[PDB]
Amino acid sequence: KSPEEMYIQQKVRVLLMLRKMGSNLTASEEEFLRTYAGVVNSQLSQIDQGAEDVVMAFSRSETED
Amino acid sequence: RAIPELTKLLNDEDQVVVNKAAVMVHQLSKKEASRHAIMRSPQMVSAIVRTMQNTNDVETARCTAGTLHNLSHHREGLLAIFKSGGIPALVKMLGSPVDSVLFYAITTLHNLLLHQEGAKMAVRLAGGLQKMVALLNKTNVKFLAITTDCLQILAYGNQESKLIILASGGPQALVNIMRTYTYEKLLWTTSRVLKVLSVCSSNKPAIVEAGGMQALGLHLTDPSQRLVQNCLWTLRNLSDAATKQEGMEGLLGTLVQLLGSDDINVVTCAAGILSNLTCNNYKNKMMVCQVGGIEALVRTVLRAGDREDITEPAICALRHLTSRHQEAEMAQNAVRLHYGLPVVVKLLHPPSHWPLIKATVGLIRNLALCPANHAPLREQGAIPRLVQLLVRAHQDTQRQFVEGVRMEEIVEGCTGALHILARDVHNRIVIRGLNTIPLFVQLLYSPIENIQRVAAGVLCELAQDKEAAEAIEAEGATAPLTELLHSRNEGVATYAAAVLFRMSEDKPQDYK
Numbered sequence: 024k025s026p027e028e029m030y031i032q033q034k035v036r037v038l039l040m041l042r043k044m045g046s047n048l049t050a051s052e053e054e055f056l057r058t059y060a061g062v063v064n065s066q067l068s069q070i071d072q073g074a075e076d077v078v079m080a081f082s083r084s085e086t087e088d
Numbered sequence: 089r090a091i092p093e094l095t096k097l098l099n100d101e102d103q104v105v106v107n108k109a110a111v112m113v114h115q116l117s118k119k120e121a122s123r124h125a126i127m128r129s130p131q132m133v134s135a136i137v138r139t140m141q142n143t144n145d146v147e148t149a150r151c152t153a154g155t156l157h158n159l160s161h162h163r164e165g166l167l168a169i170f171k172s173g174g175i176p177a178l179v180k181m182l183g184s185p186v187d188s189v190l191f192y193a194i195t196t197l198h199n200l201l202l203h204q205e206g207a208k209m210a211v212r213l214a215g216g217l218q219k220m221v222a223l224l225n226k227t228n229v230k231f232l233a234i235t236t237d238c239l240q241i242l243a244y245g246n247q248e249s250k251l252i253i254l255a256s257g258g259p260q261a262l263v264n265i266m267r268t269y270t271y272e273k274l275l276w277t278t279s280r281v282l283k284v285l286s287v288c289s290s291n292k293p294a295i296v297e298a299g300g301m302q303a304l305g306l307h308l309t310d311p312s313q314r315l316v317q318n319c320l321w322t323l324r325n326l327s328d329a330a331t332k333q334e335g336m337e338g339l340l341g342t343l344v345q346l347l348g349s350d351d352i353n354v355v356t357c358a359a360g361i362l363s364n365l366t367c368n369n370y371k372n373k374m375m376v377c378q379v380g381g382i383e384a385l386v387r388t389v390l391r392a393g394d395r396e397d398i399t400e401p402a403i404c405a406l407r408h409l410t411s412r413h414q415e416a417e418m419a420q421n422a423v424r425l426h427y428g429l430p431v432v433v434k435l436l437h438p439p440s441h442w443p444l445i446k447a448t449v450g451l452i453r454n455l456a457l458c459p460a461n462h463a464p465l466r467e468q469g470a471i472p473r474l475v476q477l478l479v480r481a482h483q484d485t486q487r488q489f490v491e492g493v494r495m496e497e498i499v500e501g502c503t504g505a506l507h508i509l510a511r512d513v514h515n516r517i518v519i520r521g522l523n524t525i526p527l528f529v530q531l532l533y534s535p536i537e538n539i540q541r542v543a544a545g546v547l548c549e550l551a552q553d554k555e556a557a558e559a560i561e562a563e564g565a566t567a568p569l570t571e572l573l574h575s576r577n578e579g580v581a582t583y584a585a586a587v588l589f590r591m592s593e594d595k596p597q598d599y600k
Contacts, residue, residue: 033585034589037582037585037586037589038586038589040578040582041548041582041583041586044579044582046511046545046548046549046586047511047552048552049552049590051593070578073411073412074407074411074412074450074453074454075368076366076367076368076407076408076411077367078327078328078331078364078367079328079360079363079364079401079404080328081324081325081327081328081360081364082286082287082292082325082328083287083325084247084287084288085244085245085284085287086245087245087246088245088246088247088248088249
């Protein structure tokens with residue numbers, strides 16, 4: 024390993040996660056993933072909590088007891 | 089005269105004479121004159137009250153209870169019964185196997201509860217609540233209608249009574265009535281009791297678990313508007329605690345139909361109930377979309393105009409329906425096909441208040457997930473307005489609750505919607521042209537994790553274009569983005585790293 028290789032592995036991981044999160048990759052990134060398909064497949068062998076809905080409390084009691 | 093003698097006879101030790109004295113009195117209470125003579129004699133009324141709660145002869149208890157019933161038609165009669173300790177005796181009679189006695193007893197109590205000052209406390213103290221709930225298993229619908237109305241009067245504005253009703257199993261008994269009988273007056277009176285109990289934090293869950301939502305739903309198409317409205321109000325009060333209920337198909341289908349009503353109260357309630365039931369329940373979301381809920385909700389919004397008591401819950405329902413379920417994508421597209429985009433974007437402007445604006449922004453964010461909505465949303469002027477709202481809300485957070493909404497929520501919501509809209513190249517140009525990059529970079533410093541996420545997110549989308557990536561770097565985004573790299577939030581860390589990679593990719597070739 025080396026700084027250079029660390030950079031590559033990190034970029035591959037980020038790009039794969041970014042695509043998984045639903046964002047499109049650029050043309051150079053798609054190319055990058057091809058150039059390092061080895062690292063990609065290497066990692067390929069290694070989310071939620073979004074639009075949660077909130078209820079509205081419509082109840083309104085009378086007064087006293 | 090007669091009264092004095094009859095009174096004496098009722099107190100006689102020979103049981104055979106009292107029974108004969110009871111018939112005479114009961115017979116006399118059926119005539120105006122003699123009736124008034126009876127109610128004006130404290131001794132007579134007291135004797136009747138004693139004879140009733142002591143006799144063991146069916147006909148005697150029936151004639152005494154019947155006499156009291158007749159007297160209860162008048163103000164003086166009600167007072168005399170009250171003062172003679174008649175309430176405790178009447179409550180005791182609620183345990184009589186004789187229907188004739190029971191009917192006279194509950195009806196007399198009903199007249200006291202409706203008109204006699206002090207009657208409610210006296211009935212509660214005598215244990216009338218527990219007795220009434222226990223009688224809910226009878227099958228005479230006119231008897232049940234009166235009994236349930238008594239419970240309504242006793243429970244109204246009295247938390248103590250509501251809890252006693254719950255402990256006695258009132259919820260299941262009341263729900264059973266709604267599922268078992270068809271008599272309109274009974275259904276109506278029972279729905280009113282349930283409405284009173286539905287605002288209580290203890291009764292609400294119990295009513296829902298007893299199958300209350302589904303039972304109330306059975307009557308939403310009844311010709312009786314008073315019954316329909318009372319069911320709708322109750323359903324709405326209960327709705328925030330019913331998002332986990334099953335077997336809601338029928339109710340959901342009817343609520344969607346009611347959205348087309350001309351009655352404002354029906355429409356408002358239906359929208360409110362649907363808003364809560366579509367909360368995090370994918371089966372409910374699926375069913376609502378299946379029966380044309382998107383089109384109906386869009387129409388409801390169109391017709392409501394500026395009536396926020398309707399548009400707010402309708403918009404929230406739409407937001408719930410365009411997210412996290414197998415048919416969300418179809419729903420996102422449906423809103424456009426039914427001409428809903430123009431009105432949704434319109435709601436972002438005055439006179440809309442903050443709650444509705446927040447819901448609308450959230451809906452737009454979901455609608456933007458559908459590429460076919462990117463251009464029309466843009467063409468409706470959504471982007472400059474979202475940016476304006478974002479800028480003002482951010483400034484407010486730098487200089488708490490406004491109409492119940494924190495401006496941090498607006499910042500997060502607007503940046504979130506712009507994040508999705510930025511997936512489109514033409515939208516990116518508009519977004520960037522509004523000089524938003526400096527702002528997005530500053531939001532990177534927000535202490536709110538979700539704000540950091542959408543700010544990094546929109547910057548990431550914008551960075552997919554070479555020129556924009558350069559402009560983002562020119563804004564000193566590198567430092568704040570670098571700090572986000574160790575965030576616990578994968579999204580934040582991923583978007584931040586992505587912007588950094590895209591910025592240092594462009595030209596950055598050799599060293600120096």
